[PDB]
Amino acid sequence: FSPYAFNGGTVLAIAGEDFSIVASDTRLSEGFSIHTRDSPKCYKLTDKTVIGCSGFHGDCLTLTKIIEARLKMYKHSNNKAMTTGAIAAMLSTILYSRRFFPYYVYNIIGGLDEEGKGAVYSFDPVGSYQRDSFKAGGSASAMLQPLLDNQVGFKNMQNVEHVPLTLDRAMRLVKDVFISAAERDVYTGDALRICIVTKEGIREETVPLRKD
Amino acid sequence: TQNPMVTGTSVLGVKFDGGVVIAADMLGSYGSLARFRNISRIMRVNDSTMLGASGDYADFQYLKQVLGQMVIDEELLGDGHSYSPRAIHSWLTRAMYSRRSKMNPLWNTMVIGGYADGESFLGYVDMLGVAYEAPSLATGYGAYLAQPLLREVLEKQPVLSQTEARELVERCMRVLYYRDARSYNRFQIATVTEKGVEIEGPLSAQTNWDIAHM
Amino acid sequence: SIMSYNGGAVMAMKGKNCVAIAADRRFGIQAQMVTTDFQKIFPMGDRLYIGLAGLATDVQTVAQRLKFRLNLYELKEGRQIKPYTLMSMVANLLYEKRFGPYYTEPVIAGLDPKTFKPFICSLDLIGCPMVTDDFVVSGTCSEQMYGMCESLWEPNMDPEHLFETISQAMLNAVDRDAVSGMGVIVHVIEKDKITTRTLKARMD
Amino acid sequence: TTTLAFKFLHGVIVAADSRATAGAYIASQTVKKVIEINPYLLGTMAGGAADCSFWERLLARQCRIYELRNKERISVAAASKLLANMVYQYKGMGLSMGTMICGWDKRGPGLYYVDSEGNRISGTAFSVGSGSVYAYGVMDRGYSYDLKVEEAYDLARRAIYQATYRDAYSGGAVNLYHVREDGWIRVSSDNVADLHDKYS
Amino acid sequence: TTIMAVQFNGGVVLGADSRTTTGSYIANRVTDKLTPIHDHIFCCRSGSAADTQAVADAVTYQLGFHSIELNEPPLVHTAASLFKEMCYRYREDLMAGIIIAGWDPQEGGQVYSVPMGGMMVRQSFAIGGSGSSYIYGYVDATYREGMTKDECLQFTANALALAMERDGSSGGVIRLAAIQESGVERQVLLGDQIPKFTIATL
Amino acid sequence: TTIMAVQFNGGVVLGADSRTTTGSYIANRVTDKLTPIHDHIFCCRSGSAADTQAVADAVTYQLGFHSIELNEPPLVHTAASLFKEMCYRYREDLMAGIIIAGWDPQEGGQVYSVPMGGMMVRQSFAIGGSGSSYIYGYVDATYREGMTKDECLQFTANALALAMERDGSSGGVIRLAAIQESGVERQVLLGDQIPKFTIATL
Amino acid sequence: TTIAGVVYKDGIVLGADTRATEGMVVADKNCSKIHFISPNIYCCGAGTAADTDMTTQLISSNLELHSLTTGRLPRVVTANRMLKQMLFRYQGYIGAALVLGGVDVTGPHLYSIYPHGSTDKLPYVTMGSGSLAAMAVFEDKFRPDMEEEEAKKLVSEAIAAGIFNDLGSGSNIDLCVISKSKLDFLRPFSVPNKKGTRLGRYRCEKGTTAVLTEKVTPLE
Amino acid sequence: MEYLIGIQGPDYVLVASDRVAASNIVQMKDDHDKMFKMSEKILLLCVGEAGDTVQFAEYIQKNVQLYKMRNGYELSPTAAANFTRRNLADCLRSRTPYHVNLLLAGYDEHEGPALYYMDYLAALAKAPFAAHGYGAFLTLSILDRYYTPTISRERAVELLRKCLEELQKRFILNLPTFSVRVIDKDGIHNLENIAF
Amino acid sequence: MEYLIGIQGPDYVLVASDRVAASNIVQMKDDHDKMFKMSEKILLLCVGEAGDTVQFAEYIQKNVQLYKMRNGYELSPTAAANFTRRNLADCLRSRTPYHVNLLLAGYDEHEGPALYYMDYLAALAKAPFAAHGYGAFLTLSILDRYYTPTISRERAVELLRKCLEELQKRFILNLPTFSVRVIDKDGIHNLENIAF
Ligand SMILES: *[B]([O])([O])[C]([C][C]([C])[C])[N]C(=O)C1=[C]N([C]2[C][C][C][C][C]2)N=N1
Ligand SMILES: *[B]([O])([O])[C]([C][C]([C])[C])[N]C(=O)C1=[C]N([C]2[C][C][C][C][C]2)N=N1
Numbered sequence A: 001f002s003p004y005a006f007n008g009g010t011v012l013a014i015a016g017e018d019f020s021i022v023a024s025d026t027r028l029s030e031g032f033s034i035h036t037r038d039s040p041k042c043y044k045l046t047d048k049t050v051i052g053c054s055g056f057h058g059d060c061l062t063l064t065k066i067i068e069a070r071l072k073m074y075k076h077s078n079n080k081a082m083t084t085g086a087i088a089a090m091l092s093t094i095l096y097s098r099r100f101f102p103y104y105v106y107n108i109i110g111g112l113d114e115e116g117k118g119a120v121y122s123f124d125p126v127g128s129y130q131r132d133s134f135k136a137g138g139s140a141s142a143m144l145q146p147l148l149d150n151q152v153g154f155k156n157m158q159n160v161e162h163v164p165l166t167l168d169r170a171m172r173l174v175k176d177v178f179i180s181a182a183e184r185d186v187y188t189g190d191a192l193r194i195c196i197v198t199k200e201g202i203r204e205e206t207v208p209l210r211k212d
Numbered sequence B: 001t002q003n004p005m006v007t008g009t010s011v012l013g014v015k016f017d018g019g020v021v022i023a024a025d026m027l028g029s030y031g032s033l034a035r036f037r038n039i040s041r042i043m044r045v046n047d048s049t050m051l052g053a054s055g056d057y058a059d060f061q062y063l064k065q066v067l068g069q070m071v072i073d074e075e076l077l078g079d080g081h082s083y084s085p086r087a088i089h090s091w092l093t094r095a096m097y098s099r100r101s102k103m104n105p106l107w108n109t110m111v112i113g114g115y116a117d118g119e120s121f122l123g124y125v126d127m128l129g130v131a132y133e134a135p136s137l138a139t140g141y142g143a144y145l146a147q148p149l150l151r152e153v154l155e156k157q158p159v160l161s162q163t164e165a166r167e168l169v170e171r172c173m174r175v176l177y178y179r180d181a182r183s184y185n186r187f188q189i190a191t192v193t194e195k196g197v198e199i200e201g202p203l204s205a206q207t208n209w210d211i212a213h214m
Numbered sequence C: 001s002i003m004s005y006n007g008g009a010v011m012a013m014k015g016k017n018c019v020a021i022a023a024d025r026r027f028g029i030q031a032q033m034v035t036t037d038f039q040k041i042f043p044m045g046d047r048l049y050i051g052l053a054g055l056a057t058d059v060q061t062v063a064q065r066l067k068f069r070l071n072l073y074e075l076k077e078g079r080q081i082k083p084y085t086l087m088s089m090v091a092n093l094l095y096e097k098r099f100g101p102y103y104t105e106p107v108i109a110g111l112d113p114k115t116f117k118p119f120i121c122s123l124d125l126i127g128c129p130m131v132t133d134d135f136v137v138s139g140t141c142s143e144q145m146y147g148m149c150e151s152l153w154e155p156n157m158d159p160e161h162l163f164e165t166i167s168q169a170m171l172n173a174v175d176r177d178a179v180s181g182m183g184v185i186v187h188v189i190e191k192d193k194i195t196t197r198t199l200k201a202r203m204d
Numbered sequence D: 001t002t003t004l005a006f007k008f009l010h011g012v013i014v015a016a017d018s019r020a021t022a023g024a025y026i027a028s029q030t031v032k033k034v035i036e037i038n039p040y041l042l043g044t045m046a047g048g049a050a051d052c053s054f055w056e057r058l059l060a061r062q063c064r065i066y067e068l069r070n071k072e073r074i075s076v077a078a079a080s081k082l083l084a085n086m087v088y089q090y091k092g093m094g095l096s097m098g099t100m101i102c103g104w105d106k107r108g109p110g111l112y113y114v115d116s117e118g119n120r121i122s123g124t125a126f127s128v129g130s131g132s133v134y135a136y137g138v139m140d141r142g143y144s145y146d147l148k149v150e151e152a153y154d155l156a157r158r159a160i161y162q163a164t165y166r167d168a169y170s171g172g173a174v175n176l177y178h179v180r181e182d183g184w185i186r187v188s189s190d191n192v193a194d195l196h197d198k199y200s
Numbered sequence E, F: 001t002t003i004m005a006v007q008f009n010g011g012v013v014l015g016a017d018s019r020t021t022t023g024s025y026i027a028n029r030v031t032d033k034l035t036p037i038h039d040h041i042f043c044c045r046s047g048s049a050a051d052t053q054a055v056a057d058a059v060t061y062q063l064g065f066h067s068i069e070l071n072e073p074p075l076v077h078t079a080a081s082l083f084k085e086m087c088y089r090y091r092e093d094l095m096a097g098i099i100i101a102g103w104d105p106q107e108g109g110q111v112y113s114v115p116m117g118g119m120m121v122r123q124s125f126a127i128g129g130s131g132s133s134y135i136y137g138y139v140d141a142t143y144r145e146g147m148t149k150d151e152c153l154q155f156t157a158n159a160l161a162l163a164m165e166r167d168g169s170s171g172g173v174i175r176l177a178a179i180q181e182s183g184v185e186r187q188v189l190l191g192d193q194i195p196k197f198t199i200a201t202l
Numbered sequence G: 001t002t003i004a005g006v007v008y009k010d011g012i013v014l015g016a017d018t019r020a021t022e023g024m025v026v027a028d029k030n031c032s033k034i035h036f037i038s039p040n041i042y043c044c045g046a047g048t049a050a051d052t053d054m055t056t057q058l059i060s061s062n063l064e065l066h067s068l069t070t071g072r073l074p075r076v077v078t079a080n081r082m083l084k085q086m087l088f089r090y091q092g093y094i095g096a097a098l099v100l101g102g103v104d105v106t107g108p109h110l111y112s113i114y115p116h117g118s119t120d121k122l123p124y125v126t127m128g129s130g131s132l133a134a135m136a137v138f139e140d141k142f143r144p145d146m147e148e149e150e151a152k153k154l155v156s157e158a159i160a161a162g163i164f165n166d167l168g169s170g171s172n173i174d175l176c177v178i179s180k181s182k183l184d185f186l187r188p189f190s191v192p193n194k195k196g197t198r199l200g201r202y203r204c205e206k207g208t209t210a211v212l213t214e215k216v217t218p219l220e
Numbered sequence H, I: 001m002e003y004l005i006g007i008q009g010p011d012y013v014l015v016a017s018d019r020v021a022a023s024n025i026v027q028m029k030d031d032h033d034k035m036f037k038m039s040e041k042i043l044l045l046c047v048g049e050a051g052d053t054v055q056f057a058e059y060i061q062k063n064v065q066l067y068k069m070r071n072g073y074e075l076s077p078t079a080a081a082n083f084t085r086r087n088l089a090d091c092l093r094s095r096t097p098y099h100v101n102l103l104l105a106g107y108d109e110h111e112g113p114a115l116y117y118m119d120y121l122a123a124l125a126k127a128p129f130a131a132h133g134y135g136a137f138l139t140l141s142i143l144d145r146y147y148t149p150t151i152s153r154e155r156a157v158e159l160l161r162k163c164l165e166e167l168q169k170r171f172i173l174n175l176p177t178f179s180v181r182v183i184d185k186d187g188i189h190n191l192e193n194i195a196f
């Protein structure tokens, strides 16, 4: 009896100086079949924090529910909402609590920090985490990471002036890298959900992808 | 339950304009043997919810009694509040995941069909605790055979009628009887609308064997 | 996996009237690097190059046996071998050991003799030919390479534009792989020249 | 992972690489393998990223609580002993961590190595990780107890550089720390690519 | 093992073989597989001898106590539900194939099937054991609605006899039981009384 | 798979299902399991499809050549002996359950059984396949000596139909064959023509 | 992989997808799965790609040699026998499940050969990982003696069912119509999938990549 | 674990190896020779399987010596390293594959000094310096940091000492003595053993 | 492999042990101490499992030191060796059994010197001399042939050298330094380390 199931799905996260984009595909699968074509992996935690998970859907559904409850309990005793950094630090301890029967989930929290600048936290299945600028996790994480490194991090480029990451240029980048991941990865496809975390709230955009 | 005993095959499910229709053959298989050919694999939770489970039949009977008590318990209070199709689906997802986390799951794959507050709900819960919603569902071998047919009708006609969805369910049941080696030609058809949950059958399909002569 | 024992990655791209073939130079046993100038790309005849990835011992064996066959073929029917003919030759060699195959995924790239039409292809361990129109990757970091080429490759690039694309794809693909890197060698095959330069990569 | 530590005449030098891997794939290249327990306590990490991170953070919380009750900073020997007893409970359960506790308490500079297996020894020069074997070569060769601060920084940087050149699981940058009597200080964080251009 | 239970208007008819084998050896050649759970409630045991005896004793205890508190003849469905509970609870530890069949004032003659997993299903007739596989086609082609208490006894004897010849784990004598409102009537069928079928010969 | 062969005065009657399953999926729902080895010699295949086809082709080749040299209709026993040879030779590599049945001028209508191991035994009627386990009791209680060519066709159709309902590996249509001295007569029984037995219901 | 075939009024219609995966990654989005055995006989192949090519290439050369000798048109039985006998000899180790369809003197014949060596002569067949999806379309809309255009539409729907429901199949749809007087190899027949248009350019301007060494060589 | 090492200079190759033969926990020999003289300017260092090393090194040697007899001239270091690599790679998928790691050192008149590294999977690789064994991990970094292409013979031996001294204090095994040789234009020269 | 050794004389016990702490193929420490001072005249030498040795030796030590505090007098060598044997034997069939081999040396005022040998299965045995590890096989025979019951302290140290010298030339492991101690009526005395 296997308690885990690979359901696929990729989640992206890019942090700006005033925003934070968290995108993911909406295809749930198993083996070679497609469960549903409409299953986004992005969840709105607070008003400035969005979590994205991929992997075993059973654990994603449970982890997300636990995080929702932990946020409510924290607001009851501390009388204030939990910050992005506090939600990342708390997730680490929750993932490591099941260290000998871990959640098969790849989480990528994206929001805004105290200052007001975009924040992105990448997590590992057992709980390890760190804050970065951009991050890709899922079944196409290895296909997208290198592109973001080159395009956003300006790695391996000798003659570039390194222009600031604007919200309009990052919106195209997320759409572009996911259109390339749907051409190679068989777990990525059908629809792309994009959540933009700004100071005026969380916006949501949906773009179609390949269905084959 | 590490190893299932008497199991059931695929359960179909498709949402239509004003309700949800669910089909399931009435057969309890013991390996490759058709042991029980008259068992109902569809249960009516309450007035707006119905359930169709595939897999271990003993687990389905345990869930049938654990759900029946819940509905009865809630009706005793009579405060107006009642479990919706979405609330039952949620409860089942937590029950399936909890069992799976304790290394002792209920070998089943359910299809929850309901109709409350003007919305048709079609849920799906497996033994690992994996759950989602969709316009049309199919478990067991129906995901490889019936799912493709249901999805090919909902792509050009997203909204279906009661008669259209029912005619599509019969076509899928007939295709499952030709290719699934663990299915029977005797099935039940449950429908949940504004009037409630109604079960019909046993029904049969119109199988043709012209290809046997060629 | 046996293929991930020595690491390495080969890439072939197509341009207007040119082809490019790049490869990593790190030779190493598992986690330890031995030399940083291992040859993974071999010349099969002026405008025809073959890049091999996988087990280093099978990379040298397959390159030597293919050369042995290629020499006899060119002497017999006194003419230059055609890119498509070499693929069939290589595929046939790999399929002889169908149940005890060589651990190497070849990547052929070159211009057709006389017509000078670009040609790139890749084969699996048992010799399964796959002729494409854009690019072909082979190595321990194909996923990373697949993502780079998919969003960088353009339909009709020139020699200079093609060199920049294949170099940026390899440099960013081998930086995500641990057992791949330590220098990158690129060969740009044109109609009258064969430019070969080693890119400045990370020595990690 | 490649982390080294050695105590010379002017305190303790701590250096580490910044690269996480998920098999052949390079997960990250900006991971901080050196965690600060407090102003006079440093802790290195090698092995299980989640294992070392959670247990060193647990040790840091224990050291802060200890200082509130006894109204004094914990020693380097007590800090390592605490951590050693923590991981011993889960011995032979899968825990993977090779830390190095460094600090300057009452008996001068102290450097202890503590792994998940059960080891807990003190020394003058340690090296944990998959690239530790390569780091040892350069370390010992250039190690001297009367090394100057500038010469000690060079040795630690050069030792991590050569280890990342030979080991595939070590790379990124080279974070260097210097523990003194007044407390540890962040010396530098040179990138391996820039070190390669300087050593060539 | 080859147990069988059929029902008629009045009540039900039970039947079983009597062979208990431990490998290729018959440890008990006259085993009594039909176990009385109550006055008008019996049960055919199949599977593990130790598991079926333990469960039958437990159910008999629980049913007896339950019937003394309610001051009424126990329902056949109640006995079957008790069996089902233990069969499902300890499904990973027990190996039983109980067939509960009896007669009560409410529903009359009933036959319940409680297979290995622990599921409970009511049928007009049920067959269990290792030798029941060979008579699946026979019971489906011979059973007819409206059988009397006399035809049911001949139907059960015929099916059990056919399973005893093909199965190595089934044999010995045949223990029948006809439960009605009047009471229970046991009957054994030995050598000459056991239905015989001419073996095809050239 | 459910194959069956019975014999009468004139010749023999064959029958089989048509389902070919690869797991819980029916790859071929109208498979022809009855294979002609010669003019008046057929054979029902069971077990592995690739193994039974390979052997049948080989035997058909050997029997055809043997019959052309002897200038005489081949004996049914000769065809069965050929099958037996290959079945025994490669018993550790093949998975077949062939049933050779035909008619020859010497012995008339004969039915031979060549099970997995490679043994050969002549019977008046034989059943093979995975679905033959459920009809063992039915054929033993229904078969009677003296059956005509018409009763044999109804006997085979009845037994195959009963096995198709209980077995998951058996189903589809029913392919019959009546071989006599006059020749071979094939016949298929589809949906409505397939014998039906009222399922016990409450 | 989704390969299928049907037998219409006067001919054979073969179809297949064009996606080739190397695990859960698309290696080739336009590979040919319909192989030429002879002028009147074609073959759709799934399973092990390398074995499917080598087996069809060998049988096609054997059928070509046989055709030159006899001087007549090859039969579908001959191709079937050769394949099934060779496949059986390797004891299933040559993973090659193909759909053999062609038209000869006896008419149009469609076979399905499995890796172990078993064959099936049916009016319609489906192979591959998306075989159950294509079979559902054939078991819901197939009718005997269909028109050429009707058979092409039904076989296109079968390949489309597999392409959109199976993760192992995608790209385009390949068709192959073999009749008594013609052979129409339509590749591609239908393109249900198309890469999305770029939202921005990522061109690598010259001089963006540093170079440590450089050596040019002038070829004749 | 046995230890081999090679250092290629401007016009010379410096090779060294441990001379310890051991069975289970005891050292049976403290003056074992792991170097095989293939020719006048070619040395084949071999380590690995108990019986395979000598069987393989002697077969190659026999053929290399046979080559000179029938031809009149010796095989070059490159050709000798390719011949041995081809023979080890042929047995790899055979009935009896030799599990041996080796280093080939030689001096070609028109090519200078050559140092070849080979593992047990028959993967040939020319290198400026190399090592085999569990001690290679500890000494490869020392080499890297101190080795320069124009290194002189005197500094090459001084550099060798450093690597061997590192093994003395860091390695867990007992390697007290090492065999040292040098190949240049005047053939192979025996150098004083480095003992500790 | 770690090495322990004990030699009991007429009125003294001589114990020695290697001071090498090692991880995989490298020696992390060359001055490690494997001796635990249980009391004023009791030494507990411990080797074995990585984490078990210290955990077990410190637990015994704590209890032996506790015994003296509450009673005013120390535990005898025999009682201390029986207490440790009883504790190791209780964990044997428990959830977490310590895999440690040890030697207990002590001097009792009314009983003289005592040398106890104990394996990981908690089997106590008094002996005139003993050893632990893979080096015990090579040195136990030397002891047997040269050890006499009336051996003097000076000859006991000379005899110890012979055993350690045998390890230097025969053992495959690297044990260059050894810790030496002696227990008599004046307590425990630190002897100069024997280095090679
Ligand atoms: B080091 O390489 O040891 C490094 C030290 C950490 C970052 C403090 N460890 C890792 O890189 C690392 C790798 N992993 C897992 C390996 C198996 C798959 C999941 C990740 N954890 N830490
Ligand atoms: B039957 O064959 O299934 C039968 C049913 C029982 C009698 C209720 N079972 C057995 O034959 C049987 C035999 N045993 C034991 C095996 C070990 C030795 C003691 C008998 N258990 N069930």
Ligand SMILES: *[B]([O])([O])[C]([C][C]([C])[C])[N]C(=O)C1=[C]N([C]2[C][C][C][C][C]2)N=N1
Residues within 6 Å of the ligand: F001, F002, F019, F020, F021, F022, F027, F031, F033, F045, F046, F047, F048, F049, F050, F052, F129, F130, F169, G114, G118
């Ligand atoms: B029967 O069920 O025994 C039947 C008899 C055959 C048709 C003569 N066997 C099969 O059903 C069967 C199926 N297969 C293969 C399994 C692998 C895929 C191809 C079919 N082999 N025998």
